[PDB]
Design a protein around this ligand. Structure first.
Ligand SMILES: O=C(O)[C@@H](CO)NCc1cc(Cl)c(OCc2cccc(-c3cccc(OCCCN4CCC(O)CC4)c3)c2F)cc1OCc1ccc2nonc2c1
Lengths: 126, 121
């Protein structure tokens, strides 16, 4: 069992939407019962998909109403995480962790470009 | 399904042995087939127990010949990582990741005290 990422680096513009992908083998048919998909960055719960259900109550505050798993692509062996309205704080190293029979995870680096004004707000906040 | 750690902080001396422990629930007899235990620090593979056996081929070089999983305790719900001859590079944040039915992981901070001579090298 192997998780793979088509690209391990994403360069995204502040304010845009981004979809970062992780691949896992599904032969030709998904067994939702045996699937757990978990997305985290730093150590914040972004997505927890178990029993074919998104589990939203533990979703971390910074990602609520902004992150979802594109479920339709699961049939293809694709756990794609979409995050809307990217912030500078979305920059960092994401991990996609998948249990499907076996277990594996992969790392994805996200870098965020932002104009002066946004960076400026980020400079005073932190 | 919940992984728990009795201690999330360990302070260990350079040159000693350390055992960091994390628990997972085992209701009935342990089902080795359905168990995966994975220990990593930063992003170095320390140990991988799958198919009821340790897989050393992905093991990070800095932990070779120094890390072992305490296998007898698995039946009790304890995936304990033992590291022998602790080095300064062993300091950091460890994650113990367990798939047993569900899946979960926990973080453990390890700090290493060392004398001048060791720190110098
Ligand atoms: O219920 C709750 O609400 C509580 C719990 O009670 N949480 C819920 C919860 C549910 C799930 Cl489903 C979860 O998913 C873990 C998960 C999902 C899928 C595969 C694995 C896995 C496990 C073992 C081995 C493995 O493969 C090894 C990879 C080796 N590879 C890579 C390296 C090489 O290149 C090649 C080999 C993958 C794996 F663990 C994590 C969770 O916790 C959230 C959290 C964790 C730490 C924190 N710290 O701070 N806040 C934190 C918040």
């Amino acid at each position: 069992f192997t998780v793979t990422v088509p690209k391990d680096l994403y360069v995204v513009e502040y304010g845009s939407n981004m979809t970062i992908e992780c691949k896992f083998p599904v032969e030709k048919q998904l067994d939702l019962a045996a699937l757990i998909v978990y997305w985290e960055m730093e150590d914040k719960n972004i997505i927890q998909f178990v029993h074919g259900e998104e589990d939203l109550k533990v979703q971390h505050s910074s990602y609520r109403q902004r992150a979802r798993l594109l479920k339709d692509q699961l049939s293809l062996g694709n756990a794609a995480l979409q995050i809307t309205d990217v912030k500078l704080q979305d920059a960092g190293v994401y991990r996609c962790m998948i249990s499907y029979g076996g277990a594996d995870y992969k790392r994805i680096t996200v870098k965020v470009n932002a104009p002066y004004a946004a960076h400026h707000h980020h400079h005073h906040a932190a």
